[PDB]
Amino acid sequence: DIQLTQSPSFLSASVGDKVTITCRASQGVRNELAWYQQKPGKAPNLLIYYASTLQSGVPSRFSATGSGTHFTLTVSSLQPEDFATYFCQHMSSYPLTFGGGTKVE
Amino acid sequence: KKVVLGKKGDTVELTCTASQKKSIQFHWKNSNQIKILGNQGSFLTKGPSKLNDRADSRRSLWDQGNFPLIIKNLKIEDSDTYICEVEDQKEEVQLL
Amino acid sequence: AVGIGAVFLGFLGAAGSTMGAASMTLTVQARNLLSGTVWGIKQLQARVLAVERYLRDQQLLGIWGCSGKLICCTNVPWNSSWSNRNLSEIWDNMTWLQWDKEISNYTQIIYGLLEESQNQQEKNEQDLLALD
Amino acid sequence: AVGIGAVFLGFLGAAGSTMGAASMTLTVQARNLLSGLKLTVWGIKQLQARVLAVERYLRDQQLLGIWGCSGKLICCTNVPWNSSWSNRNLSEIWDNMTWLQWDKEISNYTQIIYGLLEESQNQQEKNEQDLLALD
Amino acid sequence: WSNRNLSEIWDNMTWLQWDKEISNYTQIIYGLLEESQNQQEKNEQDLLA
Amino acid sequence: QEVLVQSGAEVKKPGASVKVSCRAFGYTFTGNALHWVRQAPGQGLEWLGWINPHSGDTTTSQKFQGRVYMTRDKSINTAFLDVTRLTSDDTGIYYCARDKYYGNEAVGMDVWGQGTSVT
Amino acid sequence: QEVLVQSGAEVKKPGASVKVSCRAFGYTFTGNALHWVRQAPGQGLEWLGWINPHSGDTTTSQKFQGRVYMTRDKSINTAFLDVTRLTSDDTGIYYCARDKYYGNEAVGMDVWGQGTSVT
Amino acid sequence: NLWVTVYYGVPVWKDAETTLFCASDAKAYETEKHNVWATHACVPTDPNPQEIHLENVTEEFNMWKNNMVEQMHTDIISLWDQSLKPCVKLTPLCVTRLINCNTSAITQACPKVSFEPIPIHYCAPAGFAILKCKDKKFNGTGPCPSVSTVQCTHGIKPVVSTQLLLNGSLAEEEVMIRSENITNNAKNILVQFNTPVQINCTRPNDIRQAHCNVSKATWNETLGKVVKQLRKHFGNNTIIRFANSSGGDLEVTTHSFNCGGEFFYCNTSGLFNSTWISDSITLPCRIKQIINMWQRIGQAMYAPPIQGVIRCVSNITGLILTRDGGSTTETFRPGGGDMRDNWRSELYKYKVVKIEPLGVAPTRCKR
Ligand SMILES: *[C@@H]1O[C@H](CO)[C@@H](O[C@@H]2O[C@H](CO)[C@@H](O[C@@H]3O[C@H](CO[C@H]4O[C@H](CO)[C@@H](O)[C@H](O)[C@@H]4O)[C@@H](O)[C@H](O[C@H]4O[C@H](CO)[C@@H](O)[C@H](O)[C@@H]4O)[C@@H]3O)[C@H](O)[C@H]2NC(C)=O)[C@H](O)[C@H]1NC(C)=O
Ligand SMILES: *[C@@H]1O[C@H](CO)[C@@H](O[C@@H]2O[C@H](CO)[C@@H](O)[C@H](O)[C@H]2NC(C)=O)[C@H](O)[C@H]1NC(C)=O
Ligand SMILES: *[C@@H]1O[C@H](CO)[C@@H](O)[C@H](O)[C@H]1NC(C)=O
């Protein structure tokens, strides 16, 4: 398979901070990535499709860059509704898999 | 600009005429934004004015294209400019 | 990317979609144009009028003679005075509704030029070529 | 001489012309076979007119469907012209013959033409294209 | 859809038995030949022209 | 308006098969690819399979081939997930997700169901 | 049975414009082109131009471009002639005429109207 | 360099105003006078309804200039004037500033039958479509964000009411007010609820007397959410008052409706009473024998009703009001009497469109 790793595993920050999450792929995947947010007990909500395009309804404070095997999810200001788990997935070849999971607190 | 004079204690007919011959929607209002009376299709409704129990309209004559206003026992205080609303047309008339 | 095949949006399914993606769903909206005492002949009137509505358009697509329908090409030159926008702007970035809105007043001259330019110039030249 | 363009003789207009325009204005007469209590009998008359007109167009179109042309209003078929049907030069036919008198001459022989073109050539063009698609 | 060859089907069988043997798979044939080949042949001649 | 509705909780004894349902409201069911995502308690999301609701074509990951089946019903706009021969591994939360599906390929999972708890 | 009927005689001031009508009975109006010819009293004919009644195109001689205008009306089968910027030269009888029109060209002026006197 | 191609079957619709048909279910055995009307009216329904959601597309809805309101009006006048046979009708003839009008009298047989209304649909012929606006908080006039095409309408019960709305369809999220023009003082405002108000309204075992009980607390929180929803259009600081009526005929100054074939007239003086700033209510229904006809101008006299008990419960789902603008506080007085305003609250979100499936487009072909 293609194994996807996330860094850091656990992040601690305050309100209003700009932080970055790094998604690393074991193989070339081009611009084919999706970023999701999952709250405890809820269903995941879509944030970024095609690794740079913002989903309608998501606030514009999010950004996502990257290609090849390197990807960054960047937030500029933090809010109490924003602290949840963040996932990155690939769809380039079978099978699909998700990331390890990053906790922000 | 039509101007009509009524004597005290008599009956006055007062007129607004529509362009076509159909049972349509009309309204009758005074100058200070208080409704006198209008229709609701096949019925009649009256406004919150002091002339509520005093104004009458002929239901038979509505089909011709004319919508009257009958005022009996005319007073001094009702001398005003009355407006008839017939499909966004401002037909105003002064009553003394 | 991974695919599983084409899909089915239904009737009027790609009206909000792009110009190029609505050029392969014409077959779904082809069929619906036909479909199929007092207050007992209004239904017959509606069905007969729908049949005439389909058959007039069938005659109009048979007189600009292709009959291999849902697309056919002609050699009428598209005048640059109509739709001066680029090909990539009108073929990949804009819906069909605004295209019909912008060529709403200039359709009849296009119809009258297709009917007369391409029915006595393409025809009666095959007869001259068939002399040998 | 000097000219300005074509004219519009209208519906059935070249019924006295000697081929020519009558063999050119095929599109003006084929476009109106479709036309583009008291109501329980009159409406049945009007609907019986309209549906019969739709039959009148459709059953004439099905014969052109059998004779595989699909480039309608003018199409060529490869049946040879027998001299027993009409013994005339084409300069006599296409310069000095109106359509009505030509149909009056031909109309005794028309059903044989229809049966021969239905039976022979459409059964000799189909079941031969399958033979052409062998390899 | 049918395991019979090209020889028995055109000389040893009626149309009614073939309509019985094909009625389990008429819609897949109609859908395939309606969608796929008129979605591939059309706009291919546009690329050719 | 676009929403996917799943069934209730289910507890089943190991060795048998489990069927779970997912119904679509607010969007046209026959045009959008549909994914199945399961989540173990305390772990991340693991992908199961994905189905075209029109042609009936399915594709399951090779770790779950021959044991997980995906079916659909067009007249009710529903999808059925069968997972057979359960061990204690497969206890968790099941999710059906609508794919965005732009350009006849997978794009992203925009609307998810409320999830079912299977034990 | 085929005739052309024209309007009555008119008198006009110099520098004005005059409009004269010509209605066709007894032949199909949209089938034959129409000529306009004038005749001042004392000598022969003079020619203005001719018009297609169907396509709407006109043709005018080079002595009268921008001064002589030709229109038509299909609903009442009429042709209208407008002569502007009048002098004393244009006083005479005006004629509309039906062209024979064999072989998509001009052949002869067969049926003529009774004439309209303009002074 | 570029040539044209014709396209057949394109997703292009224009606006049209053609006729349609009811296509509603008919039982064809019972004599309630809606069902035997429905058998000679139209075909029964298709059991599997078609609903196709569209992609991103905007369309301009206008429920004050719709065409299906007139179709509703013509069809339901044709139902009422063929089902309710009156004892005697007096109508103005008015043969042609002096106009002489003779009250023509029509006399016929007048039996008594049940008049429980039934749900009907409205299904367009081939080559047309019905667009439905799906915004949960719809203003009434303007663009719609995500339309959806439907085969035909949800079940509409053709009820006749004044001053109230009966057996209607609730709103999606909250109570909504709809108007052609705020600050015009001549247009009725329509109020659509989000919860039904159950009212029982029955004739107990004089024969022209009926008691009509509605709940108090549910109607109180209903009027509270109505006033909270209408305070956004008037500065959120104005006093709001409810008054009973102002003059008019008997069918407009009172809650005028039908129940069991009886023409119920109920006073609403104790129902619009409170003034707002920043157990059971009973209504005295009197069964009248005279009515003013709503299909035209004229009066109608009927028979005395059937002896026995007549019971009917209903769900209040909306209101027809109007403003009493002054020179400050705001007074809202309930109105009505035009059935076009009564049936616009069930057809507030529907549009009829005509497919024009033949277009032209430039590309790079040849013959
Ligand atoms: C209304 O809703 C519809 C959906 O129903 C939206 O339509 C989609 O819009 C998205 C853009 O947001 C389209 O996504 C794009 O798809 C491309 C597919 O590639 C094919 O098509 C291109 C067209 O030129 C060909 O060149 C190519 O060879 C393929 O054949 C992707 O390739 C695009 O991604 C690339 O381009 C962007 C451009 O910046 C880059 O940033 C990316 O990194 C990447 O390199 C792009 O994602 C989608 O295709 C549309 N759907 C359909 C069916 O066409 C409408 O946008 C929406 N709104 C409106 C107003 O209509
Ligand atoms: C597109 O077509 C129009 C006419 O359909 C062309 O317009 C011409 O404009 C000139 C300007 O004076 C006229 O003299 C011609 O008579 C017009 N043509 C016709 C046929 O009437 C226009 O030129 C065309 N566009 C291009 C780029 O050639
Ligand atoms: C032509 O017609 C005559 C009519 O009798 C017939 O005898 C002859 O065989 C025909 N010839 C051909 C070639 O059709």
Residue numbers in the entry:
A (entry chain H): 1 to 105
B (entry chain M): 1 to 96
C (entry chain D): 512 to 547, 569 to 664
D (entry chain E): 512 to 547, 566 to 664
E (entry chain F): 614 to 662
F (entry chain G), G (entry chain I): 1 to 52, 52A, 53 to 82, 82A, 82B, 82C, 83 to 100, 100A, ...
H (entry chain A): 33 to 128, 192 to 300, 325 to 397, 412 to 460, 464 to 503
Paper quotes:
The HIV-1 envelope glycoprotein (Env), a homotrimer of gp120-gp41 heterodimers, mediates virus entry into host cells. The gp120 subunit engages host receptors, while the gp41 subunit contains a fusion peptide (FP) that inserts into the host membrane to effect host and virus membrane fusion. Prior to its binding to host receptors, the HIV-1 Env is characterized by a closed configuration with gp120 protomers packed against each other and the gp41 subunit, while the highly conserved and immunodominant coreceptor-binding region at the Env trimer apex remains occluded by packing of the first and second (V1V2) as well as the third (V3) variable loops. At the trimer base, FP comprises a hydrophobic stretch of 15–20 amino acids at the gp41 N terminus.
We next sought to visualize CD4-induced Env conformational transitions that occur upstream to Population 1 by performing single particle cryo-EM analysis on a sample of BG505 SOSIP that was incubated with sCD4 for 2 h, followed by the addition of VRC34.01 Fab 30 min before sample vitrification. Two distinct particle populations were revealed in the cryo-EM dataset, which yielded reconstructions of 4.08 Å (Population 4) and 4.14 Å (Population 5) global resolutions. For both populations, all three protomers were bound to one each of CD4 and VRC34.01 Fab. The two populations differed in the extent of rotation of their gp120 subunits. In Population 4, one of the three gp120 protomers was rotated roughly to the extent observed in the Population 1 structure, while the other two protomers were minimally rotated from their pre-receptor conformation. The distances between the CD4 binding site residue Asp 368 in the two minimally rotated protomers measured 60.2 Å and was thus closer to the distance observed in the closed, pre-receptor Env (~56 Å) than to the distances measured in the partially open Population 1 intermediate (~75–78.2 Å). The third protomer that had rotated was separated in this measure from the two other protomers by 61.7 Å and 66.9 Å. Although two protomers were minimally rotated, their V1V2 regions were unstructured, thus suggesting that CD4-induced disruption of the V1V2 cap of the closed, pre-receptor Env precedes the rotation of the protomers. In Population 5, two gp120 protomers were rotated and showed formation of the bridging sheet and α0 helix, while the third protomer remained minimally rotated. Both Populations 4 and 5 were bound to VRC34.01 Fab at all the three FP sites, as expected, since the gp120 subunits had not rotated far enough to allow the gp41 conformational changes required for FP burial and steric inaccessibility to antibodies. In summary, Population 4 and 5 structures represent conformational states preceding the partially opened Population 1 conformation.
